[PDB]
């Protein structure tokens, strides 16, 4: 049924696999020249929903329907556990011996953590016995060739470390959340055999909003979209116990269905945690997207790992601006979001202090150690000008002598924001961001063009929908009287006009809100 | 087929083993002259992969090969369990007679975790009875020769504590991860019989870069490298069909294949210099090590070394790499000595312990393993980061250390020796050899720092030499940070002009970018 | 076994019986009348009524023979009434902070102890079982189980520990642990007895004078160090004699007549090891090293003579009144580095407690007010004793306002005629110390000693047996024997103002040259090097 085509995105855990399963059968001489004794054990692991059981399934299908003949034995967590006194460790050896007669064969253990927990003398003796009789008869597996043992898990730390050793489980595969190049393939696989195949550009657009999703999260919106189309088209289905008469020809899926379905959906990875990076909303985007792009260009100039081998030496950048220019609230999370596939580690006040029972120094050390472990990563310290005059005198020392110990050309990025200009910051901070290296970005107010696009939809498209030159003058005067607002005032004059419009929904004729609009625009006052 | 020469690294474990288990059994008339009384139980323990069963197999084969004067009973100590009422405890009482009729004997118990676990209200009636008979066949049916029992394990606490008592399993052998020297002979052993004989410099460098590996990993990187050659040489091996025609002579393993397999696999205040920085600071590291030799000669009667309160302080302006590159490279070169760090993120990066208590145990453990090193980097900020009790503890602690005990105190500083507080100034004695002032590198070094880039990669498929000269003409007073920053900036253009056959166009951009690199 | 627990006794070796224990003679003459006599003569303990105690506590540094005495004692009781059982538990073994396993383990252990009867229970390292309700549930049951042994028994409990102050004070009450025994590092006359015990069953028995010589060269050893150097001096002889046995698995023929042990096999064993007094205990008292002896032995003898004026127990109806002494000197005259520890070590048989910085704060991360009270109370409990406060000129400027108030009032609650000495050292002169410190030493009472530099002769003899003999050792041809003496005199003249930290550095910098010229058969390329290193040595 399913055989690799469906498996979209991974494409390298698959090539790395047939050199364990297929090659020792086909080319058993290259392993003799170097005396290789090829590997015999994988260990799939990663967050939930990201593949690896789809992979086990597709591999079983390739074996059963490919080049005869390979056997496939599958165990589900802990099945050897039996009621009598010895029938537990006997079934394991029975399985390994039956797999030797049907060889070549591959053994698959789903959800290891119920079978091989970390041994301890404060637990059941049967678990230690099972782990021992499992790492015994797997060590004596060289003479019993043509057997491959795979095990998929979720908790790599909950597996006995005596098994994660070359000889028992020598390869370890990481199944991570897809990125915008893989989510598009997945969406192509799931909307594959649809009546009116969704345009490639449409899926290209859909793959962007789905940031925290996985294969299981993407498979489900393709179903919620159809379920939304069904009740959009035929609303006379819920208010009925009997059947109806459908034509199955009027039911078509549109982008509104996908968006209303994505409204209800919550990614399985963000059901109990919130990531420190968001995107510009549909409102603020025509106001700051170009600024985001310029920031990314400068970051490329200083952090070329974001585009034979990129050379980077301690990449840092500091986004500076006036207190309302939107750098710690709008710009920096958007920059974090546009740079996906880099793990992000946050160091702001509610992280050092918003978690007690652990001094700030501990968490400050853990963040940098883990960011070193998996490079290239980002360490996000927003609002340093307040961060600095809120911490202790030893935390400054720890923070400065912990990122001086980072290898120079290791690609770890330090991102920070500021409200005071660079000159006003404490001189100890100014030593970290040098201007001649291109590590300081100064945000500026948006130009006339931007401010025009920001209001160009409210006037004149929303103020013309029932249940023109007089509107263009309103647009002109709004853009003129707002040429020196920050972001927090622009997107308030927006809301002020937004509310005005909403209060005239069922009014069948205009020229009651037009003058109301212009009066509310005239009463607006702030001036920083 | 394994007899002691297939074990790299454990040159002291093997000697102690045959000086305590083998020789009292082979030459009983010798150890009776002195009443040495060998043990009746030892125990190997350590992390997984460190050669615990390899030593057992080697010892068995060295007990068989010869004249068979000693018998070896090898028993994986978990398959001795019978799902019955009294049979597993009879195999034990039989194993001990089968080895008393053939004395001398060594009874080996591989993985005794599964034979004698900790009995409590989570154990069965079979394992408790097994322990009760095992610690009766040993304390009673022994103490005269010539049976010696060994057992292997990973955690020393996964065994019943009643077995480790005076008169029972008492001696212990800690198998730990290999250091940089053992990791070289391990690679030699695992590349013993090879077509293309590898060089010794290659294995040396590899052993340097394979940090954190434990033996078995080193056997694995050899395999994963040969899998990187094949894919490099026959990219058509995948998505194909049955073999047809393949030559097993163009699969030569190259040096860049080890560095890919070492990243397709998953595996301290001391780090060697990178390949890029080495030809810039290796000379200074040599000079520092020589000054150490001057003060630390370990790196009644005379004609053995003798030192007096070894102390050295590498001083240099900020940016001279005296605490970023130099001192950890020197700690690396001075391996085979145990190092103990004392800096900020190790005094304060842990709670549930005082900074005054984590400073006394460090000096205690440094005295127990002398000659050792105590490493305090950046004293010019270390001194103003601790409390007034920690200073008065640290000073009296390193004062109570005996006069001639070879504990070295290594430290660094960015402010000059005359800008430090008096309490520190009266701790190094510049009139002695205890202060070392770093200098900028010489023209010879600086020039050779850029040569692979200019001119051996901008011309990689001339006027470059001129540009090269200019690179040395403005970099005269650059510290290490600006130096390697300028080197990384000049290595960027090249990576941007990868697929540009026509030259003289990236040379112009290069000479204008190096004309713009300002680092005042 | 229906009791899934560690309750089995041990089969002890029968060859340990009041003959292998060397150095511990007062303790044995007391344990054999509270453990042995109630079992051997049971008619005196019923003639009147006695019901002897059921408890002993052993404490002291590690390796001092505290398990060995329990073993010897269990073998000594079970010689007429075979046989006394022996149970041994060791605190902190995979049962700490596990409720409620430890309670039933202890209950079953006491049950088994009752079933055998007579028996001896031994808790090695109780610090892991009753350290100062995971904690109350287990100590309360231990107290109830111990306090429930009938007066005659016959069950005897014994406990061992390293620091007496890491044990719950609820244990030290009569009927449970009514006596305590201190196992200290052995002096010379006990070191000789241990050496005679361990080298007793040898064909070619070592000479008595050689054992006398050995007992003095290994100071700071604890029992197990002597065992380790005796059993390793036997391996060096074999290794040096037959080095071709290490590369041959085939048992070759060896003559058991050329493997006789000699010296230079004991000292090569004593080289590669570090003693007990330099490993763990932070023993405040250490004797002068063999290098510094000829320089400071006279000062050490002078202090111990101005110390019997105040502390007339330093010559053992003596009567003293608040014995105090303060040795003062310049910063480098070695009062807190060489003199005071050697003075303390000379005063063995007197228990010594220290109050210095790494003990108040570093060790035992508790409040520094309870540790000072502990040391004062236990110092007067075992008087005559010593309290040692080194470097008061800095000690006083590091403690809090409450610690001074506790210390100054705790040494006035000591009875006036108790022999509890207070020894302190300083680097500022007496009149530079804070006034609360000056109001403790009354120099007209003789409580002050001023250290001075070593005399000309002292320095001469200090450099002599380095610069005349070791500078002419045949590398195993031509030595001058005349300019060596001139160099000795120039060195003695040049160094007539150094303190000790410099006087003993100019001794290590001159000995280095000799090492760099080990093999040179012409002893001339280092004489000039010697005198040019001395010509460039500045304070
Ligand atoms: N890379 C992918 N391409 C296509 N579909 C996918 C992919 N990953 C997941 N899916 C879909 O999501 C479903 C769940 O996948 P799967 O069960 O393999 O995840 P998992 O890692 O095994 O989850 P868990 O670890 O919780 O068991 C699959 O049935 C598959 O239809
Ligand atoms: N010191 C060493 N020298 C050479 N090879 C080694 C060494 N240590 C390990 N190896 C290689 O790694 C393999 C695994 O080592 P080994 O099984 O002896 O240790 P182990 O896994 O701790 O043993 P066990 O865990 O089964 O008791 C060996 O077959 C050997 O080839
Ligand atoms: N006083 C002593 N006399 C003879 N041998 C001793 C003495 N003290 C220690 N030893 C030797 O040291 C070994 C270990 O001593 P041990 O009793 O374990 O010390 P601890 O008191 O710390 O338990 C003993 O087996 C014995 O061989």
Residue A525: CB atoms within 10 A of its CB come to: 5
Calpha distance C287→B402 (Å, rounded) = 12
Q: Based on the number of CB atoms within 10 Å of its own CB, is B465 exposed (0-12), middle (13-18) or buried (19 or more)? A: exposed
| DSSP codes joined into one string, C30-43 | HHTTTTSHHHH-TT
Calpha distance C513→C531 (Å, rounded) = 10
Q: Are the beta carbons of C356 and B29 separated by less than 8 Å? A: no
Calpha distance B520→A315 (Å, rounded) = 19
CA B423, B425, B429, B435 torsion: positive or negative?
positive
Per the annotation, does A47 bind a ligand? yes
Calpha distance C5→B96 (Å, rounded) = 25
Q: Is A516's C-beta closer than 6 angstroms to any atom of ligand 1?
A: no
Chain B residue nearest residue C515, CA to CA: B303
Q: Is A176's C-beta closer than 6 angstroms to any atom of ligand 1?
A: no
| C contact chains, 3+ CB pairs < 8 A | B
Calpha distance B158→B46 (Å, rounded) = 12
Q: Based on the number of CB atoms within 10 Å of its own CB, is B503 exposed (0-12), middle (13-18) or buried (19 or more)? A: middle
Q: Which of B50, B226, B231 to mutate: most A Cβ within 10 Å?
A: B226
The closest CB to that of B368, out of C93, C256, C279, belongs to C279
Calpha distance B143→A261 (Å, rounded) = 79
Contacts of A313 in chain B (CB under 8 A): 484-485, 488
Calpha distance C425→A205 (Å, rounded) = 81
Degrees to nearest 5, angle at CA B345 with B342 and B351: 100
User: Which is nearest to A52 in space by CA: A184, A152, A186, A170?
Assistant: A152
Calpha distance C141→C135 (Å, rounded) = 10
Question: Residue B299 in contact with residue B372, Cβ under 8 Å?
Answer: no
Question: Residue B92 in contact with residue B134, Cβ under 8 Å?
Answer: yes
Calpha distance C390→C394 (Å, rounded) = 9
End-to-end Cα separation, chain C, in angstroms: 74
Radius of gyration of chain A (CA): 30
List all residues 6 or more positions away from A501 whose beta carbon is below 8 Å from its beta carbon.
Answer: A458, A462, A463, A513, A517
Residues with CB under 6 A from ligand 3: C 20-24, 62-68, 194, 197, 223-224, 227
Rounded alpha-carbon distances, angstroms, from residue B296 to A107, A443, B194, B338, C171: 59, 56, 42, 15, 50
| DSSP codes joined into one string, A244-313 | ----SSS----HHHHHHHHHH---TTSSS---S-----TTTHHHHHHHHHHHHHHHHHH-TT-------S
Calpha distance C447→C339 (Å, rounded) = 16
Degrees to nearest 5, angle at CA C245 with C243 and C246: 80
Degrees to nearest 5, angle at CA C104 with C102 and C108: 115
Tell how far the Cα of A119 is from the centroid of ligand 2, in angstroms. Answer: 21
The residue to mutate among B44, B48, B51, B179, having the most atoms of ligand 2 within 8 angstroms of its beta carbon, is: B51
User: Which is nearest to A99 in space by CA: A72, A75, A79?
Assistant: A72
Q: Percent helix, strand and coil across chain C, each rounded to 5?
A: 40, 10, 50
Calpha distance C357→C397 (Å, rounded) = 11
Residues facing C180 on adjacent strands: C57
User: Which is nearest to B323 in space by CA: B270, B378, B273?
Assistant: B378
Show the tokens assigned to C161. Answer: 């520990």
Portion 338-377 of A in contact with B at CB < 8 A: 358-359, 361-362, 365
Enter the DSSP assignment of A174. Answer: E
Residue the block writes with tokens 């609002």: A383
Helix and strand tally (H, E) in chain A?
A: 21, 10
Per the annotation, does C159 bind a ligand? no
Show the tokens assigned to C462. Answer: 């200090």
Q: Percent helix, strand and coil across chain B, each rounded to 5?
A: 40, 10, 50
- Ligand 2 atom 6: residue of nearest CA: B215
What is the total residue count of chain C? 539
Residue C39: CB atoms within 10 A of its CB come to: 20
User: Which is nearest to C362 in space by CA: B384, B379, B363?
Assistant: B363
Chain C residue nearest residue B167, CA to CA: C12
Question: Residue C512 in contact with residue C469, Cβ under 8 Å?
Answer: no
Question: Residue B58 in contact with residue B106, Cβ under 8 Å?
Answer: no
Ligand 3 atom closest to C71 (CA): 17
Name the phi and psi angles at B402, rounded to 5. Answer: -55, 155
Q: In what order do the strands lie in the sheet with C85-90?
A: C85-90, C119-124, C155-161, C55-59, C180-182
Calpha distance B151→B45 (Å, rounded) = 9
Ligand 1 atom closest to A153 (CA): 25
Calpha distance C182→C24 (Å, rounded) = 10
3-state secondary structure of A215: helix
Question: Residue C363 in contact with residue C330, Cβ under 8 Å?
Answer: no
Half-sphere exposure of A452 (CA within 13 A, CB side): 6
Q: Are the beta carbons of C356 and B306 separated by less than 8 Å? A: no
Residue the block writes with tokens 């209303």: A260
Strands (E), C202-266: none
User: Among all ligands shown, which has an atom nearest to the Cα of B218?
Assistant: 2
Enter the DSSP assignment of B104. Answer: S
User: Which is nearest to B109 in space by CA: B163, B166, B29?
Assistant: B163
Calpha distance C293→A319 (Å, rounded) = 69
Strands (E), C427-496: 448-450
Per the annotation, does B52 bind a ligand? yes
Per the annotation, does B239 bind a ligand? no
Residue B132 at interface with chain C, using a CB cutoff of 8 Å? yes
Show the tokens assigned to A376. Answer: 């290239």
Residue the block writes with tokens 């004699």: C241
Calpha distance B72→B271 (Å, rounded) = 44
Show the tokens assigned to B389. Answer: 């009790």
Question: Residue A156 in contact with residue A116, Cβ under 8 Å?
Answer: no
Q: Are the beta carbons of B122 and A119 separated by less than 8 Å? A: no
Q: Are the beta carbons of A26 and B242 separated by less than 8 Å? A: yes
Contacts of B81 in chain A (CB under 8 A): 86
The closest CB to that of A132, out of B113, B226, B274, belongs to B113
Residue C421: which H helix or E strand, with range? Answer: strand C420-426
Question: Residue A26 in contact with residue B242, Cβ under 8 Å?
Answer: yes
Which conformational region is residue A155 in: left (phi greater than 0), alpha (psi within -120 to 50 degrees), or beta?
A: beta
Q: Which of B126, B162, B350 to mutate: most C Cβ within 10 Å?
A: B162
Calpha distance A490→A510 (Å, rounded) = 25
Contacts of A125 in chain B (CB under 8 A): 117, 122-124, 127
The closest CB to that of B248, out of A30, A123, A405, belongs to A30
Tell me the resolution in Å: 3.2
Calpha distance A421→A433 (Å, rounded) = 12
Residues facing A149 on adjacent strands: A41, A107
Residue C386: which H helix or E strand, with range? Answer: strand C385-389
Question: Residue C168 in contact with residue C132, Cβ under 8 Å?
Answer: yes
User: Among all ligands shown, which has an atom nearest to the Cα of C187?
Assistant: 3
Contacts of B49 in chain A (CB under 8 A): 165-167
Task: Kindly give the residue spans of alpha helices, DSSP state H, lying in A138-277.
Answer: 180-190, 200-209, 215-233, 255-264
* C415–chain B nearest CA distance, Å: 32
Q: Are the beta carbons of A136 and B111 separated by less than 8 Å? A: yes
Question: Residue C191 in contact with residue C222, Cβ under 8 Å?
Answer: no
Residue C250 CA from chain centroid, whole number: 45
3-state secondary structure of A2: coil
Residue B27 at interface with chain C, using a CB cutoff of 8 Å? yes
CA A265, A269, A270, A272 torsion: positive or negative?
positive
Calpha distance A338→B243 (Å, rounded) = 46
Task: Kindly give the residue spans of alpha helices, DSSP state H, lying in B318-436.
Answer: 326-333, 344-347, 360-368, 379-382, 388-400, 422-425
Calpha distance A365→A402 (Å, rounded) = 7
Tell how far the Cα of A56 is from the centroid of ligand 1, in angstroms. Answer: 10
Show the tokens assigned to B190. Answer: 């695992």
Q: What is the dihedral of CA A339, A340, A341, A344, to 10 degrees?
A: 80
Calpha distance B315→B429 (Å, rounded) = 13
Calpha distance B180→B87 (Å, rounded) = 48
| B contact chains, 3+ CB pairs < 8 A | A, C
Ligand 2 atom closest to B54 (CA): 18
Per the annotation, does A8 bind a ligand? no
Calpha distance A297→A303 (Å, rounded) = 10
Show the tokens assigned to A40. Answer: 């015999």
List all residues 6 or more positions away from A199 whose beta carbon is below 8 Å from its beta carbon.
Answer: none
What is the total residue count of chain A? 528
| DSSP codes joined into one string, A440-492 | EEE--PPPHHHHHHHHTTTTTTGGG----HHHHHHHHHHHHHTTT--HHHHHH
Question: Residue C328 in contact with residue C426, Cβ under 8 Å?
Answer: yes
| DSSP codes joined into one string, C431-444 | GGS-HHHHTT--GG
Q: Which of C1-28 are b and which e, b meaning 16 or more Cβ less than 10 Å from the residue's Cβ?
A: eebbbbbbbbbbeeebeeebbbbbeebb
Rounded alpha-carbon distances, angstroms, from residue C38 to A366, B118, C154: 62, 37, 9
Strands (E), B154-276: 173-174
3-state secondary structure of C5: coil
Enter the DSSP assignment of B41. Answer: B
Per the annotation, does A50 bind a ligand? yes
Maximum distance among all alpha carbons in chain A?
91
3-state secondary structure of A474: helix
Question: Residue A331 in contact with residue A288, Cβ under 8 Å?
Answer: yes
* B117–chain C nearest CA distance, Å: 11
Show the tokens assigned to C196. Answer: 């005679």
Calpha distance C302→C308 (Å, rounded) = 11
Calpha distance B22→B465 (Å, rounded) = 68
List all residues 6 or more positions away from A256 whose beta carbon is below 8 Å from its beta carbon.
Answer: A232
Calpha distance A165→B265 (Å, rounded) = 11
Calpha distance A88→A95 (Å, rounded) = 11
Calpha distance A224→A258 (Å, rounded) = 8
Calpha distance C99→C135 (Å, rounded) = 10
Parallel/antiparallel/unpaired status of strands A173-174 and A41-45: parallel
Residue C155: which H helix or E strand, with range? Answer: strand C155-161
Show the tokens assigned to A70. Answer: 């390979």
Question: Residue B372 in contact with residue B408, Cβ under 8 Å?
Answer: yes
Residues facing A41 on adjacent strands: A149
User: Which is nearest to B437 in space by CA: B359, B343, B320?
Assistant: B320
Question: Residue B72 in contact with residue B65, Cβ under 8 Å?
Answer: no
Residue the block writes with tokens 């212009």: A518
Residues facing B435 on adjacent strands: B313
Residue the block writes with tokens 């236990």: C378
The closest CB to that of A362, out of B120, B157, B349, belongs to B349
Residue B54 at interface with chain A, using a CB cutoff of 8 Å? no
Q: Which of B391, B396, B398 to mutate: most C Cβ within 10 Å?
A: B396
Q: Is A7's C-beta closer than 6 angstroms to any atom of ligand 1?
A: yes
Question: Residue C517 in contact with residue C529, Cβ under 8 Å?
Answer: yes
SS (H, E, C) B351-375: CCCCCCCCCHHHHHHHHHCCCEEEE
Strands (E), B153-257: 173-174
Calpha distance C494→C537 (Å, rounded) = 10
Rounded alpha-carbon distances, angstroms, from residue B187 to B182, B221, B251, B361, C275: 9, 10, 20, 36, 39
Calpha distance C21→C489 (Å, rounded) = 51
3-state secondary structure of B196: coil
User: Which is nearest to A314 in space by CA: A382, A379, A396, A374?
Assistant: A379
Rounded alpha-carbon distances, angstroms, from residue B152 to A25, B149, B223, C115: 36, 10, 28, 35
Q: Based on the number of CB atoms within 10 Å of its own CB, is B164 exposed (0-12), middle (13-18) or buried (19 or more)? A: middle
Tell how far the Cα of C23 is from the centroid of ligand 3, in angstroms. Answer: 11
Per the annotation, does C60 bind a ligand? yes
Question: Residue B326 in contact with residue B314, Cβ under 8 Å?
Answer: yes
Calpha distance A109→A78 (Å, rounded) = 9
Q: Are the beta carbons of A172 and B266 separated by less than 8 Å? A: yes
User: Which is nearest to A167 in space by CA: A72, A37, A74?
Assistant: A37
Residues with CB under 6 A from ligand 2: A 167; B 7-10, 48-54, 152, 186, 189, 215-216, 219
Q: Based on the number of CB atoms within 10 Å of its own CB, is C309 exposed (0-12), middle (13-18) or buried (19 or more)? A: middle
* C249–chain B nearest CA distance, Å: 7
Which conformational region is residue C223 in: left (phi greater than 0), alpha (psi within -120 to 50 degrees), or beta?
A: left
Q: Which of A419-448 are b and which e, b meaning 16 or more Cβ less than 10 Å from the residue's Cβ?
A: beeeeebeeebeebbeeebebbbebebbee
User: Which is nearest to C419 in space by CA: C305, C285, C313, C308?
Assistant: C313
Parallel/antiparallel/unpaired status of strands B173-174 and C448-450: unpaired
């Amino acid at each position: 049924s399913v055989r690799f085509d469906s498996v979209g995105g991974l494409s390298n855990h698959i090539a790395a696999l047939k050199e364990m399963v297929v090659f020792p059968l086909l080319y058993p001489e290259v392993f003799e020249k170097f005396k290789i004794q090829p590997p015999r054990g994988c260990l799939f692991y990663g967050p939930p929903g990201t593949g690896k059981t789809l992979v086990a399934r597709a591999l079983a299908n390739e074996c059963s329907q490919g080049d005869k003949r390979v056997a496939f034995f599958m165990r589900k967590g802990a099945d050897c556990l039996s009621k009598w006194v010895g029938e537990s460790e006997r079934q394991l050896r029975l399985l390994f011996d039956q797999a030797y007669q049907m060889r070549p064969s591959i053994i698959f253990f789903d959800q290891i953590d119920g079978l091989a927990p970390v041994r301890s003398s404060r637990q059941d003796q049967i678990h230690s016995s099972i782990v021992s009789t499992l790492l015994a008869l797997m060590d004596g597996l060289d003479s019993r060739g043509e057997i491959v043992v795979i095990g998929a898990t979720n908790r790599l730390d909950s597996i006995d470390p005596a098994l994660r050793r070359p000889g028992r489980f020598d390869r370890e595969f990481l199944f991570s959340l897809p990125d915008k190049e893989a989510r598009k393939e997945i969406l192509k696989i799931h909307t594959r055999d649809w009546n009116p195949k969704p345009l490639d550009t449409f899926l290209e657009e859909l793959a962007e909003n789905c940031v925290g999703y996985c294969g299981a999260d993407i498979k489900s919106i393709c179903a919620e979209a159809a379920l939304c189309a069904l009740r959009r088209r035929y609303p006379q289905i819920y208010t009925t116990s009997e059947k109806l008469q459908l034509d199955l020809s009027s039911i078509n899926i549109s982008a509104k269905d996908f968006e209303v379905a994505m409204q209800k959906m919550i990614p399985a990875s963000q059901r109990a945690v919130t990531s420190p990076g968001q995107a510009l909303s549909t409102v603020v985007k025509p106001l700051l997207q170009n600024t985001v792009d310029k920031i990314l260009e400068a970051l490329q100039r200083v952090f070329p790992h974001a585009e034979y081998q990129p050379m980077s030496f301690r990449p840092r950048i500091l986004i500076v601006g006036e207190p309302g220019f939107g750098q710690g609230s709008h710009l920096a999370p958007a920059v974090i979001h546009a740079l996906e596939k880099f793990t992000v580690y946050t160091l702001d006040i509610p992280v050092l202090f918003g978690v007690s029972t652990t001094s700030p120094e501990e968490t400050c050390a853990q963040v940098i150690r883990e960011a070193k472990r998996t490079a290239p990563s980002i360490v996000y310290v927003p609002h340093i000008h307040v961060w600095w005059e809120i911490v202790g005198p030893t935390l400054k020392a720890t923070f400065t002598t912990l990122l001086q110990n980072i290898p120079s050309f290791a690609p770890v990025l330090l991102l920070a924001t500021s409200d005071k200009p660079h000159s006003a910051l404490p001189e100890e901070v100014q030593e970290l961001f040098i201007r001649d290296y291109g590590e300081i970005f100064n945000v500026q107010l948006p130009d006339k063009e931007e401010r025009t696009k920001f209001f160009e939809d409210l006037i004149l498209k929303q103020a013309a929908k029932p249940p023109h030159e007089r509107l263009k003058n309103l647009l002109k005067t709004v853009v003129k009287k707002s040429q020196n607002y920050n972001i927090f005032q622009l997107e308030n004059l927006y809301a002020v006009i937004s509310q005005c419009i909403y209060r005239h929904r069922k009014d069948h004729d205009k020229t009651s809100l037009i003058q109301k609009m212009e009066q509310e625009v005239e009463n607006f006052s702030c001036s920083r």
